């Protein structure tokens, strides 16, 4: 009946998701399970293989010129985050009605939204023992990240913890497309001017998301409910991630935070 419009919305979203996010979950799982027979990611478990993997992973983003491993890794991670924000922003623009919102609200939705979305983006690249890096060329182990000195050793663990739980829901790119749109259009962000048009758009997206999950996962029940409860946990979890980054900005003089990242962590919670 009106389901057709929700299916249309879900596809519109999946199509723009594909355009906005070059490395999809499908590709990441393919690489992580070896389904594709491109040459495996170079595994990095320690300082030595970090060094040896340099041909494939290419940590040459320090181009004024280097430093201890923890800083070089963090800046590698930081680099990709900046691009992630560029991607989430382009994807937001494709969500119907979003660019008609007040530009202050557009900014505010993204400011709070990106972090929650990045956690979901990392999950796609993750298993219980590590994360894909360099567009699937490399794989950094969870043990190696943990073993780094403070404050950097605990930076990725919360994402690993979340990723284990989140990936068990076994969502794909077509589910994730709509799920990301829902997060972005939360009308309970601090400092929003016009809540009503945000909530109107989000109404549709949750209807679209509910339908998608029934059709695409009919065997799996209360997935919609499971998924919303994760989404609320995610908001809770991001409040710690922000605090660790304040410390790194204020303590670590060797490096510095990319201005964009300074905008999205500035004046938050």
């Amino acid at each position: 009946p009106e389901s057709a419009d929700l299916r249309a919305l879900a596809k519109h979203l999946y199509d723009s998701y594909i355009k906005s996010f070059p490395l999809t979950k499908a590709k990441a799982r393919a690489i992580l399970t070896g389904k594709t027979t491109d040459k495996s990611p170079f595994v990095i478990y320690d300082m030595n293989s970090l060094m040896m993997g340099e041909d494939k992973i290419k940590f040459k983003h320090i181009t004024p010129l280097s430093k201890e491993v923890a800083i070089r890794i963090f800046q590698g991670c930081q680099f990709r985050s900046v691009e992630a924000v560029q991607e989430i922003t382009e994807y937001a623009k494709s969500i119907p009605g979003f660019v008609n919102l007040d530009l202050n609200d557009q900014v505010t939705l993204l400011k709070y939204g990106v972090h929650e979305i990045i956690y979901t983006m990392l999950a796609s690249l993750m298993n219980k023992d590590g994360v894909l890096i360099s567009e699937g060329q490399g794989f950094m182990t969870r043990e190696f990240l943990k073993s780094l000195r403070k404050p950097f050793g605990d930076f990725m663990e919360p994402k690993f913890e979340f990723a284990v739980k989140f990936n068990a829901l076994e969502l794909d790119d077509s589910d994730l497309a709509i799920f990301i749109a829902v997060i972005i259009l939360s009308g309970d962000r601090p400092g929003l001017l016009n809540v009503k048009p945000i909530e109107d758009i989000q109404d549709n997206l949750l209807q679209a998301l509910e339908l998608q999950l029934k059709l695409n996962h009919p065997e799996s029940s209360q997935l919609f409910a499971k998924l919303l409860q994760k989404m609320t946990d995610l908001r809770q979890i991001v409040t710690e991630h922000v605090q660790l980054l304040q410390v790194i900005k204020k303590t670590e003089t060797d490096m510095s935070l990319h201005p964009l990242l300074q905008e999205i962590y500035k004046d938050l919670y």
Binding site: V85, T89, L103, V107, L110, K111, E263, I264
Partner: peptide, 10 residues
Amino acid sequence: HKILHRLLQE
């Protein structure tokens, strides 16, 4: 939020 503003308008 100069950059964020700029990404949204461009």
